[PDB]
Amino acid sequence: EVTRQDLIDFVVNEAHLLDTRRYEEWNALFTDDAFYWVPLVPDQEDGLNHTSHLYEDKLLRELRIERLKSPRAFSQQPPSRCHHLLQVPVVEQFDAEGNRFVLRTGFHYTESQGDELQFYVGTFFHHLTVRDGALRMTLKRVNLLNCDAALPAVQLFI
Amino acid sequence: TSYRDNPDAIRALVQDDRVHRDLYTSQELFELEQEHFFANTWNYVGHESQLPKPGDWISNEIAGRPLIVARHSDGSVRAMMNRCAHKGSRLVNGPCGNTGKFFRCPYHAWTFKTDGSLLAIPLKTGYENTALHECESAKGLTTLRYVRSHRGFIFVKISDAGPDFDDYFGDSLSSIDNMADRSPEGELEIAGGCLRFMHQCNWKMFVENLNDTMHPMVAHESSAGTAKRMWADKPEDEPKPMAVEQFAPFMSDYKFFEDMGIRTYDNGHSFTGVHFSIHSKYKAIPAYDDAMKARYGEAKTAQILGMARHNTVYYPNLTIKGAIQAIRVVKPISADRTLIESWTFRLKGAPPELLQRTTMYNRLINSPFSVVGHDDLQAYRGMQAGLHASGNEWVSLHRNYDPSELKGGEITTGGTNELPMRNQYRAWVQRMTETM
């Protein structure tokens, strides 16, 4: 009963949750064993034998979210803000029998803090599946164009 | 003040137990560091595994000079200016490559051997009755005399001033030996990528932080306290997530950090953790322990694995962490800009789990996405801004100051002592002023 538009709608809404600080609801979109992966190099093979910027399991996602609530998260005084602009997700793999779906989504991501602002462009790969009648992510991979460049602090979730 | 050609004003910035804020904020002093301090010191430029075969090269920059570090045909490492003898073009573009038997300038194709010497000039008869042969250019590229290696770690010094390599580093190089000895083959190779994190602060704030045991329970409280809260009421020997393992000790009592100890060296080197650790079964990798014994024997394996130096500073531009095979390179850009490049090594012959742990550490602590990195960068930017205040213009370095320390030499001291920072600026003043 999953449609291609439900898959697209999922990716659009995931970015909307991040831009509206709905981090607990966002985190619940992942399966408990999923990873949130921001590679360090183009065409990186895996997140186990090569460094990444982020390769976060559920514990690490929760740690980062809870830390943003702390009155002593000095690096978020004042809080950063973000914005995602998405190109329509493209469905690369649609396997209802195998309960497996893969989307490819271009993005422009902006993060600002006070009077400072940075932007990054890239492509998402979302691996989606149905668990208990609901779509969930088993992997979110964020390929930044300039992942291996000299980057300043990136403090929110792309 | 005008610090150029003014060594007395430079000396006045550094007292025995405090330094003036202009060390951190003055662009003029940054410019003078390129001419004096960074040119008169030994600086890490790369690892031999990055240029193992003849013709291999990497590019780098030290003290504002663009360099080539290259493997010559005799197997040695040579360093030279990435600056053509004709009109100054870089001979090589990008971070690394292999040039075969000679460099070739990509503007007019003068060629140079891999030791820098001039090889050929197109249409050489155009110089026949000219003074070119009388100029430095006729030699080829400017080459560095002061190029040395220790266990694959390559260092250079631009100028003729300052201590030579062996005296500059003394026994601090033993930290490098320990990291390489942790390979069952005694060899390291660069692997796993480079995290490149731009910091909007002076290089000195990053380097001081490496010896700063009073900051973690403050600057990392939100990160560490959060980690501790998600690992509550667990057996002490239950394997921890690495984030919990690494973050939670930031909140240790001051006594823990005091007891850890610091060793300082002449010329500003240091390491934290002066004790030997007993190798336990906690998170042991049997195949690795077996491979170590097979190579080194039981007694030497215990010695290698028992060294517990949490970090080592190779002043001014390198720090290493032995037991995790991570290094951080300091690339100063301006008075308020520093790039930190964080690299890792594979332990040759070790099972893949070792590089898995090291690359995980590198991500967790040293990425531009790391919350621990955000924590410390926030502190540095806070000082970078705050130090523009007037009134009190001094940075206090008084903690545990004792004039007996002025003798220098190797000193082992308490872990909260600000000695390594005081020692560093004593070296900085000498290296600054000796060529002024």
Ligand code: FES
């Ligand atoms: S600048 Fe190199 S050959 Fe002319």
Ligand SMILES: [Fe+3]
């Ligand atoms: Fe820190």
